Amino acid sequence: VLYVGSKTKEGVVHGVTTVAEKTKEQVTNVGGAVVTGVTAVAQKTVEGAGSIAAATGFVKKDQ
Amino acid sequence: VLYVGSKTKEGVVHGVTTVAEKTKEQVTNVGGAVVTGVTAVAQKTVEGAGSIAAATGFVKKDQ
Amino acid sequence: VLYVGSKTKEGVVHGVTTVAEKTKEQVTNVGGAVVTGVTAVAQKTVEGAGSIAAATGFVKKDQ
């Protein structure tokens, strides 16, 4: 597999903006997982039997 | 497999904007997972038997 | 596999902006994991049987 290409920005994330003029915010949690705000992730190649990537708010109590 | 191409931005995410003039926000959770706000993820190639990618608010209690 | 290319910014993340004029924010948590604010991660190549990458707010009580 060869690769001449012109311009390949593959497997990325960029240029994200947010604004939150929040006022009087209250959160509470027990045991579970909670994510406010923002987050951003990118990864080119991932391989794995029963593997995990790209989870936000993810709980696994498997047996 | 060769690749000459002109312009390939494959497997990406970019340019996302949000605004939330929230006021008096209250959250609560036990055990489960809860995500406010935003998030953005991209990944080119993923391979795996029974593997997971791209989950927001995902719980797995498998046995 | 050879690689001539023109411009490949693959497996990255850049250029992210946020604003949060928060006022009177209260958080509380026991046991679980909670993430306010922002975060950003990128990784080119990841390989592993049942391995994990790119988790925000992730709990694993597997047996």
Asked whether the beta carbons of C57 and C35 are under 8 A apart, the reply is: yes
First to last CA, chain C: 41
Beta strands (DSSP E) in chain A are 12-19, 25-26, 29-30, 34-35, 40-47, 52-60
Residue C13 CA to residue A11 CA, distance in Å, equals 9
Pairwise CB contact (< 8 Å): B63 & A63? yes
Degrees to nearest 5, angle at CA C52 with A2 and B59: 125
Distance separating alpha carbons of residues C37 and C29, to the nearest angstrom: 16
Residue B17 contacts residue A14 (beta carbons within 8 Å): no
The alpha carbon dihedral of A17, A8, A41, B49 has a sign of positive
Residue C37 contacts B where some CB pair is shorter than 8 Å: no
Neighbours of chain B (3+ CB pairs under 8 A): A, C
C52/A2 Cα distance (integer angstroms): 30
Residue type at C57? G
**Phi/psi of residue B6, each to 5°?**
-115, -55
> How was this entry determined?
cryo-EM
Q: Is B6 helix (H, G, I), strand (E, B) or coil?
A: coil
The whole-angstrom separation of Cα B31 and Cα A33 is 7
C57 contacts B35 by C-beta, under 8 angstroms:
yes
Residue B7 labeled ligand binder:
no
Phi and psi, residue A48, nearest 5°: 180, 135
Q: Are strands A52-60 and C29-30 parallel, antiparallel or unpaired?
A: unpaired
Token duo for residue C16: 């992210």
Strands B12-19 and A12-19: parallel
Task: Determine phi and psi for A18, rounding to 5 degrees.
Answer: -145, 160
Per the CB < 8 A criterion, the answer to whether A45 and B53 are in contact is no
DSSP letter at A21 equals: -
Of C10, C54, C57, the CB nearest to B41: C54
Resolution for this PDB entry, in angstroms:
3.5
- CB atoms near residue C49 (< 10 Å): 12
Interchain CB contact of B39 with C (< 8 Å): yes
CA B20/CA B12 separation, integer angstroms: 25
